[PDB]
Design a binder for this molecule. Structure first.
Ligand SMILES: Nc1nc2c(ncn2[C@@H]2O[C@H](COP(=O)(O)OP(=O)(O)NP(=O)(O)O)[C@@H](O)[C@H]2O)c(=O)[nH]1
Ligand SMILES: [Mg+2]
Lengths: 161, 175
């Protein structure tokens, strides 16, 4: 019975997936991800589509100042109460970025989007070259809760070469 | 949205939640993408919600666009909580639906969870030649009879951007 409390203080990537696919009883499905630079307007990455992703990015991503990150997801036949997403990015025991969003109610058979528009954290030159030099050591956990209970867990690692 | 955030940054709770409602086809998602400086070309009817969560310097601006189709409308109530500003969008050229939209607005302004919430009414699609002017829409909906909150009607075109900043400037002044 994993909850938000268990996840919010973590200082590193999970050791392994924290639930099975069958625990996704609400059939929530992430169908699109988009990253844009808010400054120039340029879409740096978009994918339109099984719980692991490897991202092939460039150093330019680490020098951004204003970023829009969109997720798009569908929901099955059941209504979803108190849907919550917690996404955390790490490099080697350091928390780079955290996103905690309470969606609340999700309509049955819906297709929904959320774009997080945020100030990209000013990573030091030491950290930047360190993450460029070590691909896929930058990783993220995406935790999805329904009424404080973990129902879905996705993972990604990142390269900035 | 970026500059809107900065115009609201003094808000003591450090978060503002804006709810976008109105009939299907009114222009809600178009308005949202306009505000977000996003390409407005891939827009289809919203069968769910679209959210922009703008976060800077520990301030949080959340704008919620809920689908307006008759089958989505009954779920509007599930999104009322903690709303700071209601933006109600109307297709100014769809006169046959003026009574339908007045009815929905009337209901919203009786809702317990929306009591005292400032309401901006966007008389949208003013770029269309047959669009009713804002003053006429205001008369038709009896906006002058609103007792329990601050309100404003603003002529706009979500397509062209005209009138949008004036609407959002009123929003910023009235958070
Ligand atoms: N001429 C004109 N068309 C507009 C304007 N705003 C939106 N539209 C058009 O009106 C149609 C519906 O717009 P949309 O943003 O999808 O409306 P919505 O309120 O989000 N519909 P739903 O609630 O079903 O999602 C689209 O074809 C859109 O291009 C406008 O200001 N002027
Ligand atoms: Mg829409």
């Amino acid at each position: 019975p994993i909850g938000p409390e268990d996840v919010l203080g973590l200082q590193r990537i999970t050791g392994d997936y924290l639930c099975s696919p069958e625990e996704n009883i609400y059939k929530i499905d992430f169908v699109r991800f988009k990253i844009r630079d808010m400054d120039s307007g340029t879409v740096l990455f978009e994918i339109k589509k099984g719980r692991f992703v490897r991202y092939q990015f460039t150093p330019a991503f680490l020098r951004l100042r204003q970023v829009g990150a969109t997720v798009e997801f569908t929901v099955g036949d059941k209504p979803v109460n108190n849907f919550r997403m917690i996404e955390r990015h790490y490099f080697r025991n350091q928390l780079l970025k955290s996103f905690d969003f309470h969606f609340g109610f999700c309509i049955p058979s819906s297709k929904n989007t959320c774009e997080h528009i945020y100030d990209f954290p000013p990573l030091s030159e030491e950290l930047i070259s360190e993450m460029i030099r070590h691909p896929y050591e930058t990783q993220s956990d995406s935790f999805y809760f329904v009424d404080d209970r973990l129902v879905m867990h996705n993972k990604a690692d990142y390269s900035y070469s | 949205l970026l500059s809107i955030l900065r115009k609201l940054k003094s808000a003591p709770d450090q978060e503002v939640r804006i709810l976008l409602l109105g009939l299907d086809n009114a222009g809600k998602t178009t308005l949202l993408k306009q505000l977000a400086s996003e390409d407005i070309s891939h827009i289809t009817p919203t069968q769910g919600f679209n959210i922009k969560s703008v976060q800077s310097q520990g301030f949080k601006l959340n704008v919620w666009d809920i689908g307006g189709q008759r089958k989505i409308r009954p779920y509007w109530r599930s999104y009322f909580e903690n709303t700071d500003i209601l933006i109600y969008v109307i297709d100014s050229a769809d006169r046959k639906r003026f009574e339908e939209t007045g009815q929905e607005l009337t209901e919203l302004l009786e809702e317990e969870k929306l009591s005292c919430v400032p309401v901006l009414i966007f008389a949208n699609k003013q770029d269309l030649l047959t669009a009713a002017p804002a003053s006429e829409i205001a008369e038709g909906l009896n906006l002058h009879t609103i007792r329990d909150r601050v309100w404003q009607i603003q002529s706009c075109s979500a397509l062209t951007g005209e009138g949008v900043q004036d609407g959002m400037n009123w929003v910023c002044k009235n958070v």
